[PDB]
Structure 1
């Protein structure tokens, strides 16, 4: 199944996010790298947040070569609140938007551990990164957003947070489920200051994780997808662009699946 909906270049590169400073976590690989690409294409300045300085610097060099938006490095572990704040403030920029995309889904020899064999320290690390890392950026940035009465937040859930995916472990499902109600609650607290908070729940996206899934499983997942293909990272990025744009100006608290019909709930 091929791609059917192609956005013309003149629309793809419109400066919809000019004069915006957008923090993107997990931006050096995968969906986060595609989200960074899309915001730069829309003329935003992006903060490239990821773990390894070389990965972050390479990403900034790639993006800055496009002659569109600008990319600045923010190398840190999002679960370390003080290190995150220090790396954000080292840029000298004030970020009006955060896309929380960093996330982990640990496996062992390619398979997720079941709850009865799950190491507590693995559970805790996944909670720290997937859930508390998303709180951390929001705690860091919302004082400024509230004072400015201006801000946009997009979090990343998963269809596995709303129904069972046999590909993930229980910590992943629990943390992605947490994001949904967290996003509603945040939308209510921050709405009075005109700040909007939404989440994306991707299904199965063409990403490095695909090679780690057994080929029969990926085949079955595509068979379980009405649109009959994996999603592209750029399609998730299009949703993050829209949720942070003036064309979703009354949309808040929502979790939008980006999944082609897979595992609807």
Structure 2
């Protein structure tokens, strides 16, 4: 399927590892030029070298930026514009809340809202005039199924994820006549560094092994397997495509059937 992405410019946030890195690879494969970013310079340079060596025909700009920070996010967009003169695609991908409700303080909630929640809203606001001006844009938000059905070990995430799903609908409605399409994808369980970190921290809290936490997860997923970042990236790349030109304002679970199992 020709996805019409040749020479499009994609900004993928949080793209030195996990879901974000594989999305960057797959967009480069379809002919996009990239902007990649992350907080840790060493990890970012490793990712940059991997992508540059794999897709030497594509332009790739790597920038150290914390996209929870206003200054870094504003400067990321300006650097991107200085390099490419346009941004066609934005993938919003950044870290959510950390791993009883009465015990969470105001500060705890405020740090949550000042992370991924305003992070995605801010970068959306920053790219909208760019994409509107050219009557072509795609924004894909990487959210999480907890926004739809919350999980006990994920309370703050669920609140943030619900908010972002609602935001997605409101902005989609406003930007639709400009051919600026905005969607979200809710990962189920996808095998990334963060997922494997979740396996360690909860095996300890629960006094068990990563393997047993994983067997318990696998029993909940109809497919009886944890998704790969490639499987996840395929949908994101489709939504970022010319082929997805009538799809906007929706949130799609990518979860091995987890939502059918609720």
Distance 2:150 2:101 in 1: 13
- The reply on whether 1:126 has 2:84 as its aligned counterpart is no
User: 5+ unaligned residues in a row in structure 2: which ranges?
Assistant: 204-209
Tell me how far 1:54 sits from its aligned partner: 2.8
Q: Does 1:79 align with 2:68?
A: yes
Q: Are 1:220 and 2:216 counterparts?
A: yes
More helix by share: 2
2:150 aligned with 1:164 = yes
Once residues 118 and 22 of structure 2 are traced to their aligned partners in structure 1, the CA distance between those partners, rounded to angstroms, is 23
Q: Residue 171 of structure 2 aligns with which residue?
A: 186
CA distance in 2, matches of 1:65, 1:241: 21
Query: Which consecutive aligned stretches of 4+ in structure 1 deviate over 6 angstroms post-superposition?
Result: none
How many equivalent pairs are there? 246
Q: Helix, strand or coil for the counterpart of 2:139? A: strand
Report how far residue 15 of structure 1 moved: 7.4
Question: Are 1:207 and 2:192 matched, yes or no?
Answer: yes
Cα drift, residue 202 of structure 1: 0.5
Alignment pair present for 1:46 and 2:38: no
Question: Structure 1 length normalisation: TM-score?
Answer: 0.86
Q: Which of 85, 88, 103 is equivalent to 1:96?
A: 88
**In the alignment, is residue 151 of structure 1 matched against residue 143 of structure 2?**
no
Cα pair 1:210 1:218 within 8 Å, conserved: no
2:257 counterpart SS class: coil
SS in 1 for 2:226: coil
| 1:239 equivalent among 215, 224, 235 | 235
Distance 2:29 2:146 in 1: 30
User: Cα distance 1:167–1:204, how it changes in 2: closer, same or farther (>3 A)?
Assistant: farther
> Which stretch of the first structure deviates more once superposed, 208-217 or 20-29?
208-217
| Offset at residue 183 of structure 1 (A) | 0.6
RMSD: 1.8
Work out whether residues 74 and 88 of structure 1, in 8 Å CA contact, stay in contact via their aligned partners in 2: no
How far did residue 159 of structure 1 move?
Answer: 1.0
Could you list the per-position Cα deviations for residues 146-204 of structure 1 after superposition, in whole angstroms to 9, with x for gaps in the alignment?
11111111011211111122332x21111111111111111101001111000000001
Separation in 2 of the partners of 1:186 and 1:49? 24
Give 5+ residue unaligned stretches, structure 1: 1-10, 108-113
